Design a protein around this ligand. Structure first.
Ligand SMILES: CCC(C)(C)NC(=O)[C@@H](c1cccn1C)N(C(=O)Cn1nnc2ccccc21)c1ccc(NC(C)=O)cc1
Ligand SMILES: CCC(C)(C)NC(=O)[C@@H](c1cccn1C)N(C(=O)Cn1nnc2ccccc21)c1ccc(NC(C)=O)cc1
Lengths: 303, 303
């Protein structure tokens, strides 16, 4: 019993974290096989950040310009190149702790674990969602760039996020591991801002199923709804429209609990319109949207 | 920026987790140097759980009765003994991944990370508090016994919890790593129940300081209070009394933010009496009590 925001164990990722220094700037990199990946902004002076020509800035850098440390062991850089917003530093040693891995680009609404790191040293782990506006509501301080986000599936690590910057509202932006940003953001000094965000409807419905599995049932009613009529209430309360794909994804949780997807939608509609009337759901007074259907099933497991 | 429930990176602990089997029962153990620690109930049949004489049950067990696996490598048991509610299984191999470590008994209100494990394989990590009633509100399924809780301080792992059981209300009980239970609980079948719990006042005040550091200030007022007058409101709303020790602990956060401890107490008193009036604090509508002052300082870091 119980339901917690839960992160993947971080060890397989800790074994890949290194410190990358270029001049006075230090941040983190990810060492997989004989390559270290890190944000390309590591090569920039403060002045360069205002209008960087990264191609031209990189050409003036030498392999010797980069100091890479794995723990207390220096790794010699033998090649450097750029891939989108990442630097790929080829090194003289293949990481013996490289896990089975994949690079994946995740979709808005999906969740992942973040291993916050400073100076190549892991400091904490937490679970996030990629928001509809392509930011994450993380916890990052200066020095955290190059920290990564990931999921783990049967000992295979799917890396999905590398941290590049904080935005003025204090939320966070980065790239996939091919170096393409999530969202319209750019790695240079501009007035860019996160767009308006939305609540992740599918995740809220998942979390209601989790509540039911854990014994909180008070919000279930005898009301019914159609997809159209639900989406009218979603729109008013700044929720994403529910789609048929979303309904299908909720099939397994619906079958386990015996509550029809549209019946849970009727429960959510009443929660939106009326509040909780002094009650809690899994100890929350807010409707949580950072658990996916997969997270619920994984954590509540079998029987 | 940002403030998240954050766990310690779990790698140093993952390297210590093993699977312990006795007959048809499998659970987890912690392998440090040449010893594996696990809950003593691993030796029990279902029938034994009703009235176990552990001393007598253990004497009939052989070193050969225990199957211990670290990953896919079998570790041979060369001695067995009991320490309070734990078994200590001496093994033929010292764990080469044993970190610097200490065993500590934590106090109610303090937080720690839990590495949930099944069949000796880590599955997830999350942050908990030891509740005033000596339980934890964890997320554990059958098979999770022997999962551990810990903190990390400069590469030293302080182990503080080993999981033994779930209680009827769905909260969780266990021991320190000397095998002494937290709370009045026992490792046998009885009608034992968690006692009434209380909100951890010191932690709520910490989390309000974290909000201020992150830019949420709306709850600050011009009101003042005394410790006595605050404790009257604490008592009514089922909060722990604030003590002078608690006030002293909040010194650093008070100095950083410039808000006097008793002035934050006046802010909390109004929040308790009046609600939020449609506002949130760090995205919460509830007053969070599972961050200690140390957690706030660690996560918000320096400047
Ligand atoms: C957080 C404050 C603002 C909104 C102003 N943004 C930046 O400072 C940003 C940036 C400044 C100029 C361009 N960008 C993208 N940046 C980081 O966010 C970096 N960052 N990432 N996570 C952070 C968390 C807290 C603070 C800064 C953080 C950053 C990145 C690289 C540099 N490099 C050099 C040489 O100055 C400086 C700042
Ligand atoms: C969770 C349900 C109840 C409240 C009935 N308690 C137990 O089953 C308990 C227990 C049963 C009898 C004595 N105790 C302490 N126990 C575990 O909790 C175990 N446990 N720990 N975390 C759990 C999470 C979910 C379910 C069980 C969990 C447990 C421990 C060992 C056994 N051993 C054998 C041979 O039967 C059986 C049950």
């Amino acid at each position: 019993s119980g339901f917690r925001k839960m992160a993947f164990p971080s060890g397989k990722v800790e074994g890949c974290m290194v410190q990358v220094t270029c001049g006075t700037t230090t941040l983190n990199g990810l060492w997989l096989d004989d390559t270290v990946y890190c944000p390309r902004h590591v090569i920039c002076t403060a002045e360069d950040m205002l209008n960087p020509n990264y191609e031209d800035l990189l050409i003036r850098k030498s392999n010797h310009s980069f100091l890479v440390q794995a723990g207390n062991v220096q790794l010699r850089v033998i090649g450097h190149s750029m891939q989108n917003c990442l630097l790929r530093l080829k090194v003289d040693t293949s990481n013996p702790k490289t896990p089975k891995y994949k690079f994946v680009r995740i979709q808005p609404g999906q969740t992942f674990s973040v291993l916050a790191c400073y100076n190549g040293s892991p400091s904490g782990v937490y679970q996030c969602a990629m928001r509809p506006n392509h930011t994450i509501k993380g916890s990052f301080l200066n020095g955290s760039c190059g920290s990564v986000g990931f999921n783990i599936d049967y000992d295979c690590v799917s890396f999905c996020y590398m941290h590049h910057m904080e935005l003025p509202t204090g939320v966070h932006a980065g790239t996939d591991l091919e170096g393409k940003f999530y969202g319209p953001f750019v790695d240079r000094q501009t007035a860019q801002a996160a767009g308006t965000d939305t609540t992740i409807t599918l995740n809220v419905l998942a979390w209601l199923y989790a509540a039911v599995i854990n014994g909180d049932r008070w919000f279930l009613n005898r009301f019914t709804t159609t997809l159209n009529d639900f989406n009218l209430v979603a729109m008013k309360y700044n929720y994403e429209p529910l789609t048929q794909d979303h309904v299908d994804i909720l099939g397994p949780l619906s079958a386990q609990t015996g509550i029809a997807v549209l019946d849970m939608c009727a429960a959510l509609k009443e929660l939106l319109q009326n509040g909780m009337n002094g009650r809690t759901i899994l100890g929350s007074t807010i409707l949580e949207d950072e658990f996916t259907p997969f997270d619920v099933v994984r954590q509540c497991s079998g029987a």
